Paper text:
The Na+/H+ exchanger SLC9B2, also known as [name], correlates with the long-sought-after Na+/Li+ exchanger linked to the pathogenesis of diabetes mellitus and essential hypertension in humans. Here we report the cryo-EM structures of bison [name] in detergent and in nanodiscs, at 3.0 and 3.5 Å resolution, respectively. [name] consists of 14 transmembrane (TM) segments, rather than the 13 TMs previously observed in mammalian Na+/H+ exchangers (NHEs) and related bacterial antiporters. The additional N-terminal helix in [name] forms a unique homodimer interface with a large intracellular gap between the protomers, which closes in the presence of phosphoinositol lipids.
The bison [name] construct used for structural studies is referred to as [name]ΔN, because it does not include the first 69 residues of the N-terminal tail. The bison [name]ΔN sample preparation was subsequently optimized for grid preparation, cryo-EM data acquisition and structural determination at pH 8.0. The final cryo-EM map of [name]ΔN in detergent was estimated at 3.0 Å (Fourier shell correlation (FSC) = 0.143 criterion), although protomer A was consistently better aligned than protomer B, and was therefore resolved at a higher resolution. The observed additional N-terminal helix TM –1 is part of the dimer domain in [name]ΔN and is domain-swapped, mediating homodimerization by interacting with TM8 and the TM8–TM9 loop in the neighboring protomer. As a result of the tilted angle of TM –1 and the length of the connecting loop to TM1, the [name]ΔN protomers are held apart by ~ 25 Å on the intracellular side. Before masked refinement we also observed additional map density for a predicted short helical segment prior to TM −1, which sits at right angles to the protein. Finally, the modeled N-terminal extension helix is also highly positively charged and is reminiscent of the positively charged extension helix seen in the oligomeric betamine transporter BetP, which binds to negatively charged lipids in response to a change in cell volume.
Numbering used by the authors:
A (entry chain A), B (entry chain B): 70 to 293, 300 to 517
The structure:
């Protein structure tokens, strides 16, 4: 009985794993019993959890083992690669499938989470100190990049201006989902004196989404008035944010307890509800500005406990981020291997991004930013995120409803170039800003 | 602006309510968005929450306001009355409905929870000190009460012995769901020296359910062999409990952290899975003994942290109890007002309960219990619980499948008398034992 005596003391190396496996299988059985639909290996909820775990392990691997010597390996590239691998394997694409509506809802939820996290961390008096530079950085470079991309596309691909206008509007847009965490980390660190520069970027790269989607919708309609519709959407979002601000302003008082969890849940639910209501009513994207205005008003309410809830919101964002990246990167199966002289698209997107950098450097030549701040701001505006993927999916769906072969091919080319741009410029830009933060604004 | 100045300081009296209402409506909207099915006011999940809240408020009212001077008002009566009111109002019965399968699953879950809570709190060495009295109290009085009830029914109602046998088997059964909390509270209190008496009752009033259901199934089949089937079920339950005991015995070790939550979740999930597997395979009720054996083995594992998990399991049971009572009491709509000379049924059930008390006093005349312990044990075995309702529902469903009018009427009479017995003897017995605990075994 030597083996029995030796194995009598439990071995935590071989005991922890068994306990974890038993707990996981028990939870999975409970989930299956509660709902036998979309919980099987061929279901959606199983696929969501599998994608979440794959994104988590990919992010860990891209940064814990094969990270470069000086620059750490960002997890964004790992998450995008995991999504690409999940989507682009036929034998591992039929087993795991996700509903389009669920994907869109999760994308909206993640965008609302990152927007409210950015708004909560914003510092006051920045608007009064320098709002003009923020407004110019929000307005100018987006339109300039869209126009330059349209010009570059024209006389190059042969598509009419309507397709060129749509491509320029789609490409010329930066979504804060990829840049906000970097700005928040930089502000938490701090180099020299942060004279509102991180908050400046956070505010500037937030509400250009409404203008981008308005232009895209107008161009799509012309390819098939609404500028006033978008203006009304902006006004409605501002008014809703102003109205909702007075609620967190007073209802949470010192009398109540557990203010952290209650306030965080309240603001997150309000943001999600506003975004979903705006999308359902018929004018999506206004909730994106509404939640930012609500967070700004909550800061104006002098909550004095931002860091109490900032930690919880940061944890929630860290949970949601791999899911968001996997959802974005797991919708490229159609063009998995379609070489159609993609080098033209690569050249167009690269030239457009370079023009964006140049104009962003031009847009910050007024005052304050001498050299290093100019360069950092220019390189910070570079990346793009979920907004481009969502608008491209909408454009492709519209094209494949009453369109012929030529329009289908044009939409396919636009979707491919947009996906490639999202794949390239986002993680490279994130790594660049992460490495340049401690190296430019010290 | 006098009103504005006066209302400028928030009033927590009028502010807490608004915040709670906003949180509740936000959660309800989230639930509706996640699932638009069975979450509407006409759905099931809405009905479950409404029943839970009604049971909670009824239990609070029956004990916080209209409690008698010396004896506090038990909440069991309030919960049963709330269930009766919910079920027996046509305009408030169509709006809230609950699936039969969901009700049965929740009943099984609650029974498993109370069984594992009883088993965890059991004290060792009690079996070796006096197991014979426990075995006799488990076996004898159940069969004697069933036989006496059958005899009383015969020559009284005119139904044949097959119906009389079924009625006696159904009536002659005590389910621990109503007595275990009282025993645990009494053991926590302690009067003089508790020489295993509470644990004796907890063990004795646990595994008679298998014998009761086996007899009921055999009688139902005869009305349409299985004794060996029930014996095999008991053996299978014992073997499964023995096998599962070695798992909590070693897998949770000192290396792991958060032992309380992990162990509690593990044991609860194992009990639920065992009960559901036993029910699905074709031999229900064996999991009821299996979970008790598993808890006894976990105690034999010297967990030394029972009170750490006993608190959590007690909280879970306190959550589930109003739901269980509401589910039991919300299935009497058919016979809401059907006076069919019910006094005969009342007399039969009263005589049967009195005979149960007399034989229980007779069964404890061996040793140890001198006078007061005898009386307390006799009065403790009195109540009945969910088991009778479940078996009566099964009997009625079997009757209304291939049966004629006479069999339907017999089944209806049996169901009515069973419901009346559950209504009467359970809360009265609970209040009696609660008041007599500090007054008999001091």
């Amino acid at each position: 009985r030597r083996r029995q005596i030796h194995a009598c003391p439990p071995r935590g190396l071989l005991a922890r794993v068994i306990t974890n496996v038993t707990m996981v299988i028990l939870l999975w059985a409970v989930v299956w019993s509660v709902t036998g639909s979309e919980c099987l290996p061929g279901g959606n909820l199983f696929g969501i959890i599998m994608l979440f775990y794959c994104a988590i392990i990919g992010g860990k691997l891209f940064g814990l083992i094969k990270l470069p010597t000086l620059p750490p390996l960002p997890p964004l590239l790992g998450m995008l690669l995991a999504g690409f691998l999940i989507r682009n394997v036929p034998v591992i694409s039929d087993n795991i499938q996700i509903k389009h509506k669920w994907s869109s809802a999760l994308r909206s939820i993640a965008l609302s989470v990152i927007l409210v996290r950015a708004g909560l961390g914003l510092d006051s008096n920045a608007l009064k100190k320098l709002k003009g530079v923020c407004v110019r950085l929000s307005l100018g470079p987006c339109l300039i990049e869209a126009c330059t991309s349209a010009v570059l596309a024209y006389f190059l691909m042969g598509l009419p201006w309507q397709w060129g206008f749509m491509l320029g509007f789609v490409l010329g847009a930066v979504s804060p989902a990829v840049v906000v965490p970097s700005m928040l980390l930089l502000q938490e660190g701090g180099y020299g004196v942060e004279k509102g520069i991180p908050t400046l970027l956070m505010a500037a790269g937030s509400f250009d989404d409404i203008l981008a989607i308005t232009g895209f919708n107008t161009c799509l309609g012309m390819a098939f008035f609404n500028v006033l519709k978008g203006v009304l959407e902006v006004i409605i979002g501002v008014v809703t944010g102003l109205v909702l601000g007075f609620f967190i302003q007073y209802f949470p008082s010192s009398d109540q307890d557990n203010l952290v969890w209650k306030r965080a849940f309240l603001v997150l639910g309000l943001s999600v509800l506003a975004v979903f209501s705006s999308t359902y009513f018929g004018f999506p994207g206004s909730g994106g500005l509404c939640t930012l205005v609500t967070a700004f008003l909550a800061g104006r309410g002098w909550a004095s406990t931002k860091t109490d809830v900032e930690k919880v919101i940061a944890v929630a964002w860290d949970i949601f981020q791999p899911l968001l990246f996997g959802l974005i990167g797991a919708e490229v199966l159609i063009t998995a291997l379609r070489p159609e002289t993609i080098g033209l698209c690569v050249a167009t997107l690269g030239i457009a991004v370079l023009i964006r950098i140049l104009v962003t450097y031009l847009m910050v030549c007024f005052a304050g930013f001498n050299i290093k701040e100019k360069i950092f701001i220019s390189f910070a505006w570079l990346p793009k995120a979920t907004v481009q993927a969502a608008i491209g999916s909408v454009a492709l769906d519209t094209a494949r409803s009453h369109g012929e072969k030529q329009l289908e091919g044009y939409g396919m080319d636009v979707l491919t170039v947009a996906f490639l741009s999202i794949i390239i410029t986002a993680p490279v830009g994130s790594l660049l800003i992460g490495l340049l933060g401690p190296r430019l604004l010290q």
